[PDB]
Nucleic acid binder design. Structure first.
Ligand SMILES: [K+]
Ligand SMILES: [K+]
Ligand SMILES: [K+]
Ligand SMILES: [K+]
Ligand SMILES: [Mg+2]
Ligand SMILES: [Mg+2]
Ligand SMILES: [Mg+2]
Ligand SMILES: [Mg+2]
Ligand SMILES: [Mg+2]
Ligand SMILES: [Mg+2]
Ligand SMILES: [Mg+2]
Ligand SMILES: [Mg+2]
Ligand SMILES: [Mg+2]
Ligand SMILES: [Mg+2]
Ligand SMILES: [Mg+2]
Ligand SMILES: [Mg+2]
Ligand SMILES: [Mg+2]
Ligand SMILES: [Mg+2]
Ligand SMILES: [Mg+2]
Ligand SMILES: [Zn+2]
Lengths: 56, 82, 151, 51
RNA sequence: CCCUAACUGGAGUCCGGUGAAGCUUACAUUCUAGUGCACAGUCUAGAGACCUCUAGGGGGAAGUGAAGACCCCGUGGAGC
RNA sequence: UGUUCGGGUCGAAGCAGGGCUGUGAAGUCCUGUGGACCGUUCACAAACGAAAAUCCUGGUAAUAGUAGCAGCAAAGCAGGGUGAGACUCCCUGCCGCCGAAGGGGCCAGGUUUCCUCGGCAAUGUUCGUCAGCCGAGGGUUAGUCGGUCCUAAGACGUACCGUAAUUCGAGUACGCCGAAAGGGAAACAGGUUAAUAUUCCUGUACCAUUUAGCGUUUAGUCUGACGUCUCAGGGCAAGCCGAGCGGCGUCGUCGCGCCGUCUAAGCAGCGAACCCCGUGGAGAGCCGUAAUGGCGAGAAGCGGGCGAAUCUGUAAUGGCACAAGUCGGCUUCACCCCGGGACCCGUGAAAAGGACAGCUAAAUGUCCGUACCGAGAACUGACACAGGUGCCCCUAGCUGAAAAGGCUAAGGCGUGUCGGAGUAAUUCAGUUAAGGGAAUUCGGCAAAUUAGCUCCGUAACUUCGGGAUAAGGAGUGCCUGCUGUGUAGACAGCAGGUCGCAGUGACCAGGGGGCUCUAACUGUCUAAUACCAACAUAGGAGAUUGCAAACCCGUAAGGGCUAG
RNA sequence: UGGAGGACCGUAAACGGUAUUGAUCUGCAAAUCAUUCGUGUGACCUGCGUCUCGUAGUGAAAUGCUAAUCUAACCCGGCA
RNA sequence: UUAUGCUAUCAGGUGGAUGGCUCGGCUCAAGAGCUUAUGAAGGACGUGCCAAGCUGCGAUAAGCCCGGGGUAGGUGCAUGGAGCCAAUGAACCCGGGAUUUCCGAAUGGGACCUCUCCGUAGUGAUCAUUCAUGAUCGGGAACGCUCCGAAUUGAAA
């Protein structure tokens, strides 16, 4: 069975749900974490310095 | 906080009046107990049962059966439907 | 006429048949086109304008003639057999019917006094051992050996 | 017949009622300057990111 | 296979409808030889060549597709 | 930009074309177009000059009215409508497709695609009046169907401890979640809409909790609660046959063919096997089974208890052309009940819940889902995609071993959405082919041969299992009349007659043998060029370690192996 | 009689993917189609759930697979 | 009437360059500078007569109340129809209040369920105090402090 279009017919599920906290469809249904805002992992909002460039 | 918004007046909703039932658009946050108490306080007729459904407009519709015959007609005349 | 397709679908629902079973009168097309509700379709159905065409079954008469001949033992020769001997007559079923017939025969013979327990036991084991082809063979062995307590 | 909870169906209902044309009177009022909006879609396309 | 023939259905061919893409600096009806970065439709000297269209198989355009994966080079990498 | 001097609605900038000057970069003027800004001196600045970067962005050619709209399901025609317009939309008939899937049900997913009306610019591989398209409006009703409840593998939270620290980390303790295919309290038939219907309505039921009265533990057990293979018995949906009745078809002759002849839950009644209890006393042996078996440690026989599916009645008036509606028989999968056996170096979940003491009445039963598709057009693969998800679970008659293949129902379709025409080469896929028969070719690649079933017969070699369907031979249809086995369904066999080139007549359906290499074998693999001799395997051997072990993970706290 | 086996034949059930080096190769398809083939009671196939991942995981081991990406994935950042 | 074509100009189509305009951007300077359990920021959903997006607002939902300024119109981006409001002083602006769904630090429990379960109506976790009470939590463009800490690269390796 080809790794291309044939295996893409099994895409009848999800790995990420809608996030309560931020509204992004980034809540991992297995790890119970939002990969966008960090909901379900931290009480704070997920932010990294590498999300932008070094400001210089 | 009243759960009752207004009577639903469509063809199918008006077909209920000939079986003494009356359909309302209600607050979707409310339940059958609140709908029954709100209608009984709003018009003072005893409610036999409540049927409720949610629509694809995001509304909640409640169908109310009344105990006293002609109560649906009396409320529909008081509102101004008939 | 515009589409009578809505009326045909409604009439197939009301008649409980398939869509192509529904017959719409090609002369009463404008009468049908005015029918919007299930009550109108019911009226057209009751007045014969709309009906369900007869189901065209599969007739089975020539299969009946063949089945009668096969019951008589014909049309069933080697050039007609396609399944293995064993798919046409399973062997365990053959043994089951054979041994049950033999055992019932022996039981009735022991019951009605024609067979005492000593020879009944040996005959029962012989039947279990495939010594007799059928009830007739067992009876023939009984009469040849004179094992029946005749009176 | 997938099974939605109350909120998932509410979000689907909002997506459905967003998929409407701009009113004709809005087009008249804006003098043909507002004739569409970005939430138009078709059900048989790239699906909703809602449910 | 000798050695191919006839026939069947779908394409193709012709008609109506619909309707893309890929090569393209230019010019261009060529052929021979020579010349030239030693493999030229365009240079040189000859020989040919009235134009347009259709069908056709692919000789040529060192046809098109892809900054050769072979070889070497780089004080370039990666894995082992 | 500073500064000097100006031009412009009596027409600035820009744009198209032209005149003149300048070696030139360029400048200026003229005509048209355009409608509000533009220059100039001396200086000063810069995000300051493009033909090139397989340059970037946009626009737009040639190709070209060309390829495609064929191959895996070659499907349409007549007549009548509608409409401005009809191969393509609607009706009737005829002719077709699928018919163990292209029908039926539904998961995930989709998310309004559902229904009605009104449209046709785009979408639809053509057209279109049609439409999953466009616009407007409408549509989803539950104590009993699911979720909800329970726990599974396994997550998550808090605490503790670690960590420089944390949103990081294993373990422990306590919690909590985790199944729309596991467990599970209870509802059926009919009707109703355009679209919902075990949800609304009619009829007839049932379950749970709380309350009130009437009575109370047996309490800790059982149930929930279980693998694979195989088989008996009983039942039954579907299926089939005969008779009556009621329709339809056929009717050149005949009297056949088809359809129907119905009936839920609930309630009440009976109860097969197994098991148990009381009698009984059975061996130079008896009793059983499909089979294994059983028996003085108590067989057969005889009584009793417990205990099914289903069946019978009632619900019986509902729906049916208020047309009939009455009967029998056979079989029964692929479903239900029940019991047996065999296998395991494999042992086949848990918990909620339920039962064991409840009866009567009244009240309560909230929340979420519910439309429709479920795929050759509603999902996913950018698509109305020949893939995948799903063939996931179901399926009528004949042939036949069969759910194969063929031909037909029901149901779904003529949309695996371009048509016409019939005339070259060539081409994709097929049919046939004299005589020869592998001479072809790297190589019998491709194609052809054989083919079902019954009977006869079957070699070398062998690990004794096999080789084996070896090989090689014969038969096979139809009709008439029968025989045997069997409770039956059926199965097996015989005699005679007879037609054809041909009787497994189509469909379906091995070609066979000999000698070598290699790997023992079934199995695994380069998703998308390698299905092999490679990997694995059982077998054989070696090594470490006595458990606070060997080996291994972690920074630690602590872990895997190890419930060993 | 019995009904064992990583037993046999065989399905366009399901799974796999031999050969045609066929069709297709701006495809129906960024791996499909036809015919022909292998397994088809078991080291079987498969739904849903759940866990294991980047010098890590997974692998009956091909450097195979880990979202069309694999001799060290992907995203952003170091980075102009 | 020489077709198919070729070259130049013109007219038109297509297209959106150029010019002109700009409520936008960018940079620099001067100020000002915390907020949230009295539930923030952020998100979801709802909210308009005809309303789909954005914006505002929160079931009192393009809004409600009071004081001041303003004064004759108003009804957001966004002059359409029809109404409504406004001299009882609206709109608008400044100040102060009210309302303020669900999620979210999110905090009665649980979230592939922005909802759901118990309802004994909710002080979740860690802490201080006498045990009335109180503190901490999330957010903020950069700046600040503490701790952990690469490689490309350069050295022409
Ligand atoms: K349904
Ligand atoms: K050996
Ligand atoms: K260097
Ligand atoms: K180096
Ligand atoms: Mg891949
Ligand atoms: Mg920085
Ligand atoms: Mg060097
Ligand atoms: Mg340029
Ligand atoms: Mg067929
Ligand atoms: Mg079209
Ligand atoms: Mg409901
Ligand atoms: Mg649970
Ligand atoms: Mg054609
Ligand atoms: Mg092998
Ligand atoms: Mg090996
Ligand atoms: Mg096989
Ligand atoms: Mg970078
Ligand atoms: Mg803070
Ligand atoms: Mg260096
Ligand atoms: Zn989030």
């Amino acid at each position: 069975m080809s790794k291309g279009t044939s295996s893409m017919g099994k895409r009848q599920k999800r790995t990420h749900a809608k996030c309560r906290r931020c509204g992004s469809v980034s809540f991992n249904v297995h790890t119970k974490q939002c990969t966008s805002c960090g909901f379900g992992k931290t009480s704070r909002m997920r932010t990294y310095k590498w999300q932008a460039k070094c400001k210089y | 906080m009243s759960s009752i918004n207004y009577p639903f007046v469509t063809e199918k909703a008006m077909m209920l009046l000939d079986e003494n039932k009356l359909q309302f658009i209600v607050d979707t946050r409310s339940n059958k107990k609140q709908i029954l108490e709100d209608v009984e306080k709003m018009y003072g007729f005893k409610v036999k049962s409540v049927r409720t459904m949610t629509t694809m407009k995001g509304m909640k519709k409640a169908v109310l059966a009344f105990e006293e015959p002609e109560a649906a007609h009396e409320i529909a005349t008081r509102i101004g439907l008939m | 006429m515009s589409d009578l397709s809505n009326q045909r679908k409604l009439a197939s629902k009301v008649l409980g048949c398939g869509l192509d079973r529904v017959w719409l009168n090609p002369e009463a097309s404008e009468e049908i086109a005015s029918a919007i509700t299930r009550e109108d379709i019911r009226g057209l159905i009751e007045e014969g304008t709309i009906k369900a065409k007869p189901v065209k079954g599969v007739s089975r008469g020539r299969a009946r003639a063949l089945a009668a001949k096969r019951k008589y033992g014909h049309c069933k020769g080697h050039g007609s057999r396609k399944g293995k001997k064993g798919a046409r007559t399973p062997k365990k079923e053959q043994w089951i019917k054979k041994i049950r017939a033999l055992r019932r025969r022996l039981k009735e013979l022991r019951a009605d006094g024609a067979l005492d327990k000593s020879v009944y036991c040996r005959l029962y084991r012989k039947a279990k051992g495939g010594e007799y082809r059928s009830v007739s063979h067992l009876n023939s062995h009984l009469e040849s050996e004179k094992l029946l307590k005749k009176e | 017949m997938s099974h939605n909870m109350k909120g998932q169906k509410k979000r689907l209902a909002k997506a459905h009622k967003q998929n409407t044309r701009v009113p004709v009177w809005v087009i008249v009022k804006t003098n043909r300057k507002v004739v569409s909006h970005p939430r138009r879609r078709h059900w048989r396309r790239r699906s909703l990111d809602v449910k």
